[PDB]
Amino acid sequence: VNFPFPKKMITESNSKDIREYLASTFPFEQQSTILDSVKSIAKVQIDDRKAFDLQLKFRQENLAELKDQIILSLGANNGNQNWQKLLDYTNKLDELSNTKISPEEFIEEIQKVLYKVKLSTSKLYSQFNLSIQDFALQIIHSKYKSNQISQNDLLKLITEDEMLKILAKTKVLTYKMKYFDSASKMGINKYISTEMMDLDWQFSHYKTFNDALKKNKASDSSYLGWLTHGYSIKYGLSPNNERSMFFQDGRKYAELYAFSKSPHRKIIPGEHLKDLLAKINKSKGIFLDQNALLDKRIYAFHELNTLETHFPGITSSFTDDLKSNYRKKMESVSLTCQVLQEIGNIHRFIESKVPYHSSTEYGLFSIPKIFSIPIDYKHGEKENLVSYVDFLYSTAHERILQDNSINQLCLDPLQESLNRIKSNIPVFFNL
Amino acid sequence: TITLEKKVRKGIESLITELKLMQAVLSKVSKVPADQLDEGVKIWAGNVKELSYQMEDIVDAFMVRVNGKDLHRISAALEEVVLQAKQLAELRQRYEQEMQTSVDPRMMALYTDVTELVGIEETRDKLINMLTEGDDWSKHPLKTISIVGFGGLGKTTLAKAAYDKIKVQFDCGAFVSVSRNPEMKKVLKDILYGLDKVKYENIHNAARDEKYLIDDIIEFLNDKRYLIVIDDIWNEKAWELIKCAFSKKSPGSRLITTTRNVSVSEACCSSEDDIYRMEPLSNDVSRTLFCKRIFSQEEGCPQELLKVSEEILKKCGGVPLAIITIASLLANKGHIKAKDEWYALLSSNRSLEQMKKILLFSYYDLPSYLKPCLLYLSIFPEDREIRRARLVWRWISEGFVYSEKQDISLYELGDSYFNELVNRSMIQPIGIDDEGKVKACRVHDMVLDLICSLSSEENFVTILDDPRRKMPNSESKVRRLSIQNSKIDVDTTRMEHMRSVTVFSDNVVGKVLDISRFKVLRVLDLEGCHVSDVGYVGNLLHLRYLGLKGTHVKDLPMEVGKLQFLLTLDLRGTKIEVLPWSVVQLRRLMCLYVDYGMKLPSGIGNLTFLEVLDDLGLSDVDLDFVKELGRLTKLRVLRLDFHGFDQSMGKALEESISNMYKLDSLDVFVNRGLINCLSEHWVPPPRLCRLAFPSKRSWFKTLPSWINPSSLPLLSYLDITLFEVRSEDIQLLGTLPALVYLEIWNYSVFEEAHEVEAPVLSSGAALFPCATECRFIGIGAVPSMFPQGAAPRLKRLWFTFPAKWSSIGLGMRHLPSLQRVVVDVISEGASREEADEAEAALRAAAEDHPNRPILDIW
Amino acid sequence: TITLEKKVRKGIESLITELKLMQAVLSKVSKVPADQLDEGVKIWAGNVKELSYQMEDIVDAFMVRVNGKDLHRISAALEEVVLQAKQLAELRQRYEQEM
Amino acid sequence: NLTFLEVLDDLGLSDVDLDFVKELGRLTKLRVLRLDFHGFDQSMGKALEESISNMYKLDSLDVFVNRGLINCLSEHWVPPPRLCRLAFPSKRSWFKTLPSWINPSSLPLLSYLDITLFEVRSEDIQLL
Ligand SMILES: Nc1ncnc2c1ncn2[C@@H]1O[C@H](COP(=O)(O)OP(=O)(O)OP(=O)(O)O)[C@@H](O)[C@H]1O
């Protein structure tokens, strides 16, 4: 049996309740929602100063907790991995985090720590290393938001090559390490786009940097996107099993940039532009045939989406686009990935409602137990959650186009998710 | 065991001499057309060919493997092959007994009715205008036109049409045809008899030498206007001699020549504007000719035949000869054939014999050392295109390329062979390589069928398709194999003497066949297949070409060091990361393709003879490596990456580069920043001809000082991105002699916030001799750039124009040869009312030009 | 017995080539009208025809029957027919005069 | 097992089981065929017509039937493409109206025909 889709048109009345509910409960504060796209759900009234000092406390607690674990991990280790070195790293971490200093000193020490963590025995050892890096750049983001650092120096810090080659690595690896098992058990991992990574409260800071580059140098923003997608393919979020045509190679970004500055190159292409466009048309064709396998179509969609979002107009060929009408299809799949990510967020949040779930369900050091959002069912929650999921599915059901050639990638994931969610909502609602 | 060695040496020398003699005989035989050989000589020649193969194999085995067992096997094989040679000689001597001429098949075409030609009017009138061209054409000096193309294209038909049309406006004329092996007396007598049938009526019986005939022709043409057509010229000496009769000056006279060879046409005409290149018919014209030829009166094709008709017309290619012959084949004047019979013909008589005999003239005319190089093209599939570098390296590996001079490189010999094949109009070139040469080539389909039949009749190549071209019925000795349909299964237990294997299948069954049993291989080509790992590549000991491109190979066996003969090693698109160390010990190696993500071992200096090196890593490398780089002295192509390479040691690198005397192309790729190598006072190599920095985000500072036209006398390509361009920088580029292509970027305009500045050129004329393209991306000015008329060869211009400068003139009459202009406008400073103003203004400025180039504002 | 098999194969291949050559010669001869041939060529051609018949029979016997006795008979016949061919060749060479 | 059979004349086709009529479908390069239908039981004609449709190269075909209505070569048969001669010399065993597969698309080649129908229509000569 398939549960039928909810059919509601969005009302400002329940909009008020759902809005203050999202603005009040902790995890939904720092995240934004797709529903902001709706006509009339306005009246947010949010201030970020409180959320900011909350993030300060969260970072302090998490660094303290991992340090607590580091001492005892040094106590009884299976092959000494120089854990006191990572301890010194978290020492200078807390040092830089607590005091106010001159901007130059912060630059020097941040660069030093980051460049020396750059250079395999244990796995949670590497996890601790990755968390060190993530906390360091989170400190960077907070410090910038704390108005203690200008814009000029922040750019001079971030735009240099090594920092660009690190942002993407961390942004992909931490997300994988934190959400891959959840995505696998939920069965949506096949729909994970690097484009929508910075929509979780766990990766809001990245987003900041992103618009910062959209502030000043779009070239570096597009370069960062083309870098992070390649790094995602490398570490096995999307296996193609043979090779990528245009993502791991340095001489491809040069051609893309050259086209981006003078577009007429597309009309009179060189050889490298020629085989680029040939591969693009081939991947397009693969994406637009319904009885090819699902994984190939998903991979092709991801590649084409990254190319179109970062280098606009390169994938466009006027005539055949109308006969195929794949543009709206792309938009539909993107909408599907966004809504699926949010549904996974809600499913993870449900675990906070379990009477016995002191253990965090988001990842290592996602939440310090000093806050440890409780089991206390509130007045609104039991209604607001079901209302929010119904509104999500209703808002989604409209913009999606319906055709069995495209139905395979957007309709059935939503249908299966609605089924799983409608099945597991009650059993958790009892106990 | 000493006498064993000496006896074997003597036997080998004898074999070498015998091989020379056999090749002489075979080359002599292979010139006669098949209609004049008798069966005895043909059979004997086939057997001689087989013996030649065996003796070559024995000689090669001795050269490679040189112990007791080897010498014993070699002595046994030597004795056996000598015995077989004697036996065949006696056999031929046993049954030897000593015991008219046809006409050229192209002669009948001159008597074809005129109402059966489809699309001549346009080309006929274009040629006529190319002849007269004006009102006072009867007062200009003598002019010569030439027509080139492949056979069966319709050259003599067009010449005949124009001649019959305009012969009235002259005094005397003639229409002569020269064959392949001409007699000059006959040609001169033909001209004389054509000029006046009454006076020189018996001229064909006179017996004088050429000087007196030429004098007669000169005396008769005094004070006359003449129009003369000379047809089917096949080489240069003929024209060099016939040109003497038209030595005097005669205002208003015209000559036309038709030929298949391009150099001959360049030698006939003076300017390259007096060359007409025949091109095939369009699709509609071809279809009407087809219909008219067969459905003659109805001209209505039934529907079931439409798609087979379209595929057949695509296979013909717009060549009238093929269209006519296939239409006569399908007509079957009694009855149109059935649809399934059309399909059978598509998948697979007098007219057909005539067409084959006509097309084979270009094959029987090649020099003897070019015939194998052509047949080798029958290995590749039908409609795809072939990389030329692949061809050249495989020709060198097979042994078709050799010379005795001491100072010659085989790579440029092979390139010359390829260019000669293109010159005779037997190959269509396509694209431009990344080293300034042709990229790929295509072959017509009927030519491909002819080549396949020719090469099959001699066991040159065996193709494996399942529907057609199955295994030969009775053949135990196959030398070259080509797998195209993986459906078939292969025996490969009788194919002891293989030489070359090639797989064209994406299929898994393609990797099924066993290879380690071909103990004598020279060419292994698995490009594109999905093989995963090859540990058996060692133990082959004979390879010359190892092509593994686009395969799923992760790592190489550390035994490749045994392949002491290995010319080419191609690793691109594979999954390898670190090359095995023993690679250093491949002393004979001439070409190394590799990705920049692969680690090379240390002692790379030992690989002398390297002529091509592609995509050096240059990252995480010490100094002795960059110093070793200076030992590869005969190296003609280089590509670098500068990825992790530390820019503190660039001086050693530039010295090592300056050490290479012979060198043509060079790349430097840099991610970002300022390039910290190739400093001034560098003394680049003299023969450099192509230079490129495709980075586009790593700038130079002002300009390298070594760009003066004295240090780089030869240069036909350049691609640079400067930080800030001056006005007297384009001047230095004007100083360069050749500089065919040019492309400059201004880094400050895009990445920084600087504004477009108008450059001004001054103090000179003829600034850009031989500049056919120029792309000043980031800096633009039409008039002030080119004063007095300079660069009278430009054809494509790229420049930028701010809308601010709406109020400099866009006059395009400085430059005659303009054909295309691409512009981009900056509109933020000026309002839209100035924007569309400037748009319409430059549009009109383009419209006034007589050539009327095309615009793009973007 | 391995050696015998190898030898018989070689002999048979040689016979096949020789048969091709003989048929070429005979076809070339049989075009001339009888008034332009001379007697020497005519007689030699008759004898060549007979030898061709014998060699065809030997090849066919090998193809059908292929053991010891058979291979022995085939080797004997092979040697004899080769000898006869050589003898006829010498005979023709002995009395050839161009005039 | 007798592949390479190019000509087969006057098959018995009487007192025969099905595997025989199925084997008949293996002779692929067979250009002439003649049948007798004497004691052959007309319940298995479908297997026979499939086996016949399996022979791609084929020129001539006969079917001889003593009496009655011919219960083989039913419609939707897809005759071989190259057929050029067809004959039923019975003269006392009729077809019904007409085989449907006589359209000029299925038999582009045909230079001979000999049929005895039960009742001829007026728009039967049209198809011819
Ligand atoms: N426009 C046309 N319409 C119909 N038939 C044509 C046309 N052009 C050429 N042909 C036919 O093509 C055949 C061969 O053309 P032609 O011999 O003139 O080519 P060519 O260039 O002289 O060939 P080659 O180089 O071998 O001399 C002629 O029989 C002619 O009838």
Three-state SS annotation for chain A: CCCCCCCCCCCHHHHHHHHHHHHHCHHHHHCCCHHHHCCCCCCCCCCHHHHHHHHHHHHHHHHHHHHHHHHHHHHCCCCCCCHHHHHHHHHHHHHHHHCCCCHHHHHHHHHHHHHHHCCCCCHHHHHHHHHHHHHHHHHHHHHHHCCCCCCHHHHHHHCCHHHHHHHHHHHHHHHHHHHHHHHHHHCCCCCCCHHHHHHCHHHHHHHHHHHHHHHHCHHHHHHHHHHHHHHHHHCCCCCCCCCCCCCCCHHHHHHHHHHHHCHHHHCCCCHHHHHHHHHHHHHHHHHCCCCCCHHHHHHHHHHHHHHHHHCCCCCCCHHHHHHHCCHHHHHHHHHHHHHHHHHHHHHHHHHHHCCCCCCCCCCCCCCCCCCCCCCCCCCCHHHHHHHHHHHHHHHHHHHCCCCHHHHHHHHHHHHHHHHHHHHHHHHHHHC
HSE-up (13 A, CA, CB side) for residue B341: 11
Residues B687, B658: contact at Cβ < 8 Å? no
Determine which of B303, B341, B342 to mutate to test the interface with D (most D C-beta atoms within 10 Å). B341
How many whole angstroms separate alpha carbon B550 and alpha carbon B531? 10
Measured CA distances, D110 to B331, D64, D66 (Å): 19, 20, 25
Measured CA distances, B678 to A389, B657, B722, B745 (Å): 64, 9, 14, 19
**Hunting for tokens 């390069």 — which residue is that?**
D29
Residue C20 touches chain B, beta carbons under 8 Å:
yes
HSE-up (13 A, CA, CB side) for residue B732: 15
The encoded tokens of residue B610 equal 């390297």
Size of interface B-C (CB pairs under 8 A): 39
How many whole angstroms separate alpha carbon A279 and alpha carbon A258? 18
E strand or H helix at B802: strand B796-802
Residue D89 touches chain B, beta carbons under 8 Å:
no
The encoded tokens of residue A312 equal 């606009």
Within 8 A by CB and 6+ apart from A260, the residues are: A219, A222, A311
Within 8 A by CB and 6+ apart from B86, the residues are: none
How many whole angstroms separate alpha carbon B259 and alpha carbon B180? 11
The encoded tokens of residue B216 equal 């007669």
Pairing verdict, β B796-802 and B773-777 = parallel
Name the DSSP class of B622. -
How many whole angstroms separate alpha carbon D126 and alpha carbon D128? 5
How many whole angstroms separate alpha carbon A141 and alpha carbon A51? 14
The encoded tokens of residue A50 equal 């409180």
Within 8 A by CB and 6+ apart from A208, the residues are: A141, A144, A145
Q: Which atom of ligand 1 is nearest to the CA of B232?
A: 27
Main-chain dihedrals φ then ψ at residue B174, nearest 5 degrees? -160, 160
Q: Which atom of ligand 1 is nearest to the CA of B281?
A: 1
Indicate the residue of A219, A251, A262 with minimum beta-carbon distance to B669.
A251
Residue nearest to atom 31 of ligand 1 (CA): B109
Q: Tell me how far the alpha carbon of residue B175 is from its chain's centroid.
A: 33
The answer on whether B152 is annotated among ligand-binding residues is yes
**B93 in helix, strand or coil?**
helix
Residue B2 touches chain C, beta carbons under 8 Å:
no
The answer on whether B260 is annotated among ligand-binding residues is yes
Reference B276, options B257, B297, B295; nearest CA is B257
Q: From the CA of B102, how far away is ligand 1's center (Å)? A: 20
Q: From the CA of B155, how far away is ligand 1's center (Å)? A: 6
Residues B629, B651: contact at Cβ < 8 Å? no
Beta strands in B105-205 (DSSP E): 143-148, 172-177
Determine which of C3, C9, C10, C28 to mutate to test the interface with B (most B C-beta atoms within 10 Å). C28
Are A258 and B552 inside 8 Å of each other by CB? no
Name the DSSP class of B588. B
How many whole angstroms separate alpha carbon B256 and alpha carbon B834? 54
Measured CA distances, B296 to B283, B328, B333, B335, B342 (Å): 18, 11, 11, 13, 18
Within 8 A by CB and 6+ apart from C58, the residues are: C15, C74, C77, C78, C81
Name the DSSP class of B605. G
How many whole angstroms separate alpha carbon D74 and alpha carbon B271? 76
Reference B836, options B821, B812, B857; nearest CA is B857
Helix then strand then coil, in percent of chain D rounded to 5, is 15, 10, 70
How many whole angstroms separate alpha carbon A114 and alpha carbon A166? 9
Domain range B359-464, CATH architecture: Orthogonal Bundle (1.10)
Indicate the residue of C21, C29, C85 with minimum beta-carbon distance to B43.
C21
Reference B146, options B136, B156, B135; nearest CA is B156
E strand or H helix at C9: helix C2-29
Indicate the residue of C14, C18, C24 with minimum beta-carbon distance to B39.
C24
CATH classification for the domain delimited by B108-277, as one of 3.40.50.300, 3.30.70.3040, 1.10.3720.10, 2.60.40.10: 3.40.50.300
Name the DSSP class of D41. -
Determine which of C3, C17, C42, C52 to mutate to test the interface with B (most B C-beta atoms within 10 Å). C17
Burial class, B300, CB count within 10 angstroms (exposed 0-12 / middle 13-18 / buried 19+): exposed
At residue D60, what is the residue type? S
Measured CA distances, A45 to A10, A23, A25, A29, A342 (Å): 20, 8, 14, 11, 22
Is the CB–ligand 1 distance for residue B155 below 6 Å? yes
How many whole angstroms separate alpha carbon B239 and alpha carbon B182? 11
Q: Tell me how far the alpha carbon of residue A371 is from its chain's centroid.
A: 24
> What DSSP assignment string belongs to C37-51?
--HHHHHHHHHHHHH
How many whole angstroms separate alpha carbon B186 and alpha carbon B183? 5
Q: Which residues of B touch C41 (CB under 8 A)?
A: 97, 99
Name the DSSP class of D90. T
The encoded tokens of residue A417 equal 């998710």
Residues B276, B147: contact at Cβ < 8 Å? yes
How many whole angstroms separate alpha carbon B599 and alpha carbon B579? 6
Residue B47 touches chain C, beta carbons under 8 Å:
yes
Q: Using a threshold of 3 CB pairs under 8 A, tell whether chains A and C touch.
A: no
Is the CB–ligand 1 distance for residue B358 below 6 Å? yes
Q: Which residues of C touch B81 (CB under 8 A)?
A: none
Within 8 A by CB and 6+ apart from B534, the residues are: B548, B553, B557
Reference B117, options B165, B177, B150, B166; nearest CA is B165
Are C27 and B47 inside 8 Å of each other by CB? no
Three-state SS annotation for B807-854: CCCCCCCCCCCCCEEEEEEECCCCCHHHHHHHHHHHHHHHHHCCCCCE
Is the CB–ligand 1 distance for residue B109 below 6 Å? yes
Helix axes A161-186, A123-145, angle to 10 degrees: 120
HSE-up (13 A, CA, CB side) for residue B387: 7
How many whole angstroms separate alpha carbon B331 and alpha carbon B837? 62
Within 8 A by CB and 6+ apart from B154, the residues are: B278, B320
Are A251 and B824 inside 8 Å of each other by CB? no
Is the CB–ligand 1 distance for residue B321 below 6 Å? yes
Q: Tell me how far the alpha carbon of residue B440 is from its chain's centroid.
A: 7
Radius of gyration (C-alpha) of chain D in whole angstroms: 14
The encoded tokens of residue B626 equal 């960059």
E strand or H helix at B746: strand B743-746
